[PDB]
C-alpha cells in the first residue's frame, strides 16, 4: 500500500473536495463520524482504501487531505458540515483576506506568508505515510488562490517531494458561472508556472458541466452544488483504481505511463456516461455498447472539443457496475468501424480497460439517477488544445491593451511574466499542432 494525499486549494478546490470525500465515504461505507463497520482491522491496516484514509485507535477513518483557502467562509462550511467529524483542525487552513481573483496576490503577496504553514501541515500528513506516492491537487484556474497559490505550492512540493507524482483536477473558467473578468490571465499564468511540476492534469470546463446538468439533469440554472456532485462522480471514477482492488492505474505513476507519452502534453480528456436524472421514475438502462459509444459524443466530454479533428495518444476506459470484458470488446469493434478514431503513428491503436463491479454510488437526494453501469473514458487527444486556443485568444485581446495588468504589477509581478507565460502557451499550442495535424473556383 502507498498513500495518496489530496490538497484542495481555493473555493472551487475546497467545495469540490467536500463533494468528493462525501462520495468516497458512501462508496467505502464510512459514516460521517468516521466509523467504518467493514474495516475489521481496528486502528490500522494496508487495504486499498487506506491509500486515502488513515485510521485512529478509536476506529475513525480520517481523509489524507489538506484544505487551504485565503479566506475562511468556504472552509468554515467544512468545519460545520455533515462530515465535520471526519477532519481534525490541522487539516483546515484559512487566511483572513483572499487573493481578489489576482494571481499575483495569491502567488506572491499572500502566498509567501502562508506557504510555510501549508507545507508544515502537509508534512504532518506525509510523516504518517509508510510509502507516500504523491499528491492530488484540486483548484480553479480562474481564482486568485486556485491559480496563484497552487502554482507556488506545486513548485515547493517539487522541491520537498522531488520523487513524488503530482496530479491535478483543474477547473477551466466559463463565463456562464465565472466570477472574474481576469480569469484568462490567471489561467495562463498558473498553467505556465505549474506546467513542469504536474505529471498529469484533468481539466474540467465549467461550461461542459453546466450544459450536461441543463441537458441531462433538466436543471434550468445549475448551482455549484449541482456542478460539484457531477464533478465528484468523474473524480471518483478516475481515483477509484487507487481506492479499490485492481490491476489498472493502481499508483499515480501509472497515470503518467498509461496516459502521458510526452511530459508537457499531460492533459487527458475525460468523458463520462451515462448522466441521467433522478426525477424520472423509469429510465431505460444503457448497455455497454451504448455507454461506450457515448464516450465519443462531444456532449459528454468534460471539455467541449472535437476529437475527430485531432489524434489520440492513449485511451483508457474505466467501467463501474455490471460490465464483462466480452461486451466491451464487442462495443469497441462496432465503434471503431463507425467513428473517427485516429492515433498518432508512433503509438499503438488500443484501449486499456478497467472494470469495477460496484455500480457508481450517488448521493441520496442528489440529481443523478442510480444506474446499472457507467464508464469514464480518459483519452489524451490533441483536440483538447482547442481549450488552450480559446483561453489564449481571450488573453491576447486584453493584454494587447494591458487591461487590468496594473493589478498584477501592483502586487510585485512584472509585465515580463505575462509575455513569458503567453509564449509558453504558444509553444504548447505548437506542440499539440505538431503531434496531431496531418477561392472563386
Amino acid at each position: 500500500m502507498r498513500e495518496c494525499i489530496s490538497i484542495h486549494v481555493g473555493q472551487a478546490g475546497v467545495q469540490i473536495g467536500n463533494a468528493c470525500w462525501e462520495l468516497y465515504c458512501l462508496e467505502h461505507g464510512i459514516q460521517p463520524d468516521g466509523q467504518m463497520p467493514s474495516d475489521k482491522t481496528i486502528g490500522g491496516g494496508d487495504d486499498s482504501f487506506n491509500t486515502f484514509f488513515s485510521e485512529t485507535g478509536a476506529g475513525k477513518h480520517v481523509p489524507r487531505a489538506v484544505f487551504v483557502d485565503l479566506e475562511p467562509t468556504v472552509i468554515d462550511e467544512v468545519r460545520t458540515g455533515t462530515y465535520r467529524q471526519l477532519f481534525h483542525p490541522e487539516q483546515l487552513i484559512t487566511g483572513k483576506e483572499d487573493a481578489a481573483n489576482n494571481y499575483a496576490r495569491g502567488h506572491y503577496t499572500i502566498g509567501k506568508e502562508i506557504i510555510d504553514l501549508v507545507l508544515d501541515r502537509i508534512r504532518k500528513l506525509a510523516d504518517q505515510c509508510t510509502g507516500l506516492q504523491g499528491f492530488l491537487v484540486f483548484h480553479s484556474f480562474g481564482g486568485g488562490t486556485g491559480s496563484g497559490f497552487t502554482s507556488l505550492l506545486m513548485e515547493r512540493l517539487s522541491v520537498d517531494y522531488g520523487k513524488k507524482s503530482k496530479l491535478e483536477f483543474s477547473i477551466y473558467p466559463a463565463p456562464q458561472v465565472s466570477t472574474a473578468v481576469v480569469e484568462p490571465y490567471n489561467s495562463i499564468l498558473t498553467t505556465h508556472t505549474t506546467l513542469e511540476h504536474s505529471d498529469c492534469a484533468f481539466m474540467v470546463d465549467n461550461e461542459a458541466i453546466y450544459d450536461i446538468c441543463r441537458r441531462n439533469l433538466d436543471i434550468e440554472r445549475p448551482t455549484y452544488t449541482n456542478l460539484n456532485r457531477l464533478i465528484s462522480q468523474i473524480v471518483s471514477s478516475i481515483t477509484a483504481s487507487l481506492r479499490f482492488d485492481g490491476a489498472l492505474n493502481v499508483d499515480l505513476t501509472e497515470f503518467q505511463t498509461n496516459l502521458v507519452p510526452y511530459p508537457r502534453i499531460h492533459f487527458p480528456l475525460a468523458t463520462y456516461a451515462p448522466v441521467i436524472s433522478a426525477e424520472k421514475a423509469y429510465h431505460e438502462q444503457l448497455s455497454v455498447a451504448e455507454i461506450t459509444n457515448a464516450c465519443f459524443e462531444p456532449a459528454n466530454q468534460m471539455v467541449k472539443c472535437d476529437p475527430r479533428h485531432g489524434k489520440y495518444m492513449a485511451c483508457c476506459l474505466l467501467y463501474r457496475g455490471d460490465v464483462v470484458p466480452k461486451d466491451v470488446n464487442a462495443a469497441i469493434a462496432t465503434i471503431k468501424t463507425k467513428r473517427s478514431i485516429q492515433f498518432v503513428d508512433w503509438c499503438p491503436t488500443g484501449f486499456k480497460v478497467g472494470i469495477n463491479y460496484q455500480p457508481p454510488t450517488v448521493v441520496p437526494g442528489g440529481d443523478l439517477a442510480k444506474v446499472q453501469r457507467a464508464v469514464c473514458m480518459l483519452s489524451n487527444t490533441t483536440a483538447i488544445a482547442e481549450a488552450w486556443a480559446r483561453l489564449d485568444h481571450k488573453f491576447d485581446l486584453m493584454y494587447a491593451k494591458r487591461a487590468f495588468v496594473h493589478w498584477y504589477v501592483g502586487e510585485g509581478m512584472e509585465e515580463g511574466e505575462f509575455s513569458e507565460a503567453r509564449e509558453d502557451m504558444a509553444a504548447l499550442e505548437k506542440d499539440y499542432e505538431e503531434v496531431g495535424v496531418d477561392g472563386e473556383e
Partner: protein, 426 residues
C-alpha cells in the same frame, strides 16, 4: 469578517449618508434603537460588514459623521435613525467651509482632520479584517469636497493597502447652490483620480431630470434627489451586504471593474422608476430594459456616446435566474457595438433573493463607460469659463492657494478626458 468603515462629510454627504443608513437598517431588520427584529438569518449573515455588535446584541453602524458646521449633523441626530449612530463618531466644527474647497482642504478642514482620523483609527482597530472605506460627499461644496478629499489622502497614507470607495455627488448649474461649484469639483476630481479605487458619479442634473421627467415631480427637492441616491446606494452595496459569489468585497469589485487605474468612475442606475401603476408587477424583460436605459442612469451621460469597459448588474427579488440570463445576454448581444471587444465577457450579473422594502423586483446598474467623459467635459467647460477671467478666485487665494494650483487641476481633468477618448476609439 471583512469590515467596511463608512464616512459621510459635509451637508450633502451627511444627508445622503443618513438616508443610506435608514434604508439598509430596514433591510437588515435594525430598528432606530439598534435592535434586530427581522425574520431571516440572511439579514445577519454579513451584517458585520457595516455594523458593529455592541453589548446586548445591539448593532451600531460603523459610520463616522464629519462636518465643519453643526447644523446638518444636529438634524441627523434629531432624525429618524439619528440615535443609532455612535455619539463619539460625530466630529464637527463650528466655522463652516463657505462652499470653499480651500477652506475644507487647507485651512478650516486641516484644523479638524486629526480628530476624524482618531475616530477612523478607533473603528479600524476594532476590525477583524478591514477591507476598506466608503465616503459619501458632494464635490461642489467645501467640506465634503475639500475636507473629504483631504481625509481620503490622509487615510491612504495610514492605510495604503486598503480599498477607498466614494459616492461623489457632481454639481450641475441646474441644481446649484453657488457659482464656484465647478472650481471645487475640478480640484476634487483630481484627488479622486489619484486616491480612490472606485467612485460612483452621482450627477445632480440626472437626479433632477429623473425626478421631473420620469417620476413626474414638478418641484423636486433635495430630499427627492436623496431618495433616489439611497435606493441606488443600497443596490450597489447589496453584493457586499448579503451572501453572494460576484463582487462580494471591495477589492474583487475593483479588479472586475477597473481595467486602468485612473478610469474608475462609474455611472450607476436603478430600476424600476415610475410615477405614482405603482402596484403593477414588473417582469424581468422590463427590469433589464429600464436598467440599461440612459433615462435610468444617474450621471447625465449618454452611454451611446461612448463604450462600456465593464458592467455589473444586480437583480433583487424572487425571479427566474434563467430568464435573467436570457434578457441580460439579449441586451448584450443586440447592442454589442457599445461594449469594448478587447475585454471579453465584461458584463457580470448577480442576483440577491432579498428585495428592497416596497418592491418585489428591482435591478441596479454599475457601468464603467467612456461616456463619463461628458461629465468631466461639462465641469471643465464651466471651470474655464470663469478661470479665463480669474472670476471668484479671491475666495481661494485668500485661503493661501495660488493660481498655479487651479491651472494644474484644469490640466489634470483635461488629461482624464483625453484618456477616456483614447479607449473610446480603441
Amino acid at each position: 469578517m471583512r469590515e467596511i468603515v463608512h464616512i459621510q462629510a459635509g451637508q450633502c454627504g451627511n444627508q445622503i449618508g443618513a438616508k443610506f443608513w435608514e434604508v439598509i437598517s430596514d433591510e437588515h431588520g435594525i430598528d432606530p434603537t439598534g435592535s434586530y427584529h427581522g425574520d431571516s438569518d440572511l439579514q445577519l449573515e454579513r451584517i458585520n460588514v457595516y455594523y458593529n455588535e455592541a453589548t446586548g446584541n445591539k448593532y451600531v453602524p460603523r459610520a463616522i459623521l464629519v462636518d465643519l458646521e453643526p447644523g446638518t449633523m444636529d438634524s441627523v441626530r434629531s432624525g429618524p435613525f439619528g440615535q443609532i449612530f455612535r455619539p463619539d463618531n460625530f466630529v464637527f466644527g463650528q466655522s463652516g467651509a463657505g462652499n470653499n474647497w480651500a477652506k475644507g482642504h487647507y485651512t478650516e478642514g486641516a484644523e479638524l482632520v486629526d480628530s476624524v482620523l482618531d475616530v477612523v483609527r478607533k473603528e479600524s482597530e476594532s476590525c477583524d479584517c478591514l477591507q476598506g472605506f466608503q465616503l459619501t460627499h458632494s464635490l461642489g461644496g467645501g467640506t465634503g469636497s475639500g475636507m473629504g478629499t483631504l481625509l481620503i489622502s490622509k487615510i491612504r497614507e495610514e492605510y495604503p493597502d486598503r480599498i477607498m470607495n466614494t459616492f461623489s455627488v457632481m454639481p450641475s448649474p441646474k441644481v446649484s447652490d453657488t457659482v464656484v461649484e465647478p472650481y471645487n469639483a475640478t480640484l476634487s476630481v483630481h484627488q479622486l483620480v489619484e486616491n480612490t479605487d472606485e467612485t460612483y458619479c452621482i450627477d445632480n442634473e440626472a437626479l433632477y431630470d429623473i425626478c421631473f421627467r420620469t417620476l413626474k415631480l414638478t418641484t423636486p427637492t433635495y430630499g427627492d434627489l436623496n431618495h433616489l441616491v439611497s435606493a441606488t446606494m443600497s443596490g450597489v452595496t447589496t453584493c457586499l451586504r448579503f451572501p453572494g459569489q460576484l463582487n462580494a468585497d471591495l477589492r474583487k469589485l475593483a479588479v472586475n471593474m477597473v481595467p486602468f487605474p485612473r478610469l474608475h468612475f462609474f455611472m450607476p442606475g436603478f430600476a424600476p422608476l415610475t410615477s405614482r401603476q405603482q402596484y403593477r408587477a414588473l417582469t424581468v424583460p422590463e427590469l433589464t430594459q429600464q436598467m440599461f436605459d440612459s433615462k435610468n442612469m444617474m450621471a447625465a451621460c449618454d452611454p451611446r456616446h461612448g463604450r462600456y469597459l465593464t458592467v455589473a448588474a444586480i437583480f433583487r427579488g424572487r425571479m427566474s435566474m434563467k430568464e435573467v440570463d436570457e434578457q441580460m445576454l439579449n441586451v448584450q448581444n443586440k447592442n454589442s457595438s457599445y461594449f469594448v471587444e478587447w475585454i471579453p465577457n465584461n458584463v457580470k450579473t448577480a442576483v440577491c433573493d432579498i428585495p428592497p422594502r416596497g418592491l418585489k423586483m428591482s435591478a441596479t446598474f454599475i457601468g464603467n463607460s467612456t461616456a463619463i467623459q461628458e461629465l468631466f467635459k461639462r465641469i471643465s467647460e464651466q471651470f474655464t469659463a470663469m478661470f479665463r477671467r480669474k472670476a471668484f478666485l479671491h475666495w481661494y487665494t485668500g485661503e493661501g492657494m495660488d493660481e498655479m494650483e487651479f491651472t494644474e487641476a484644469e490640466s489634470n481633468m483635461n488629461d482624464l478626458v483625453s484618456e477616456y477618448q483614447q479607449y473610446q476609439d480603441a
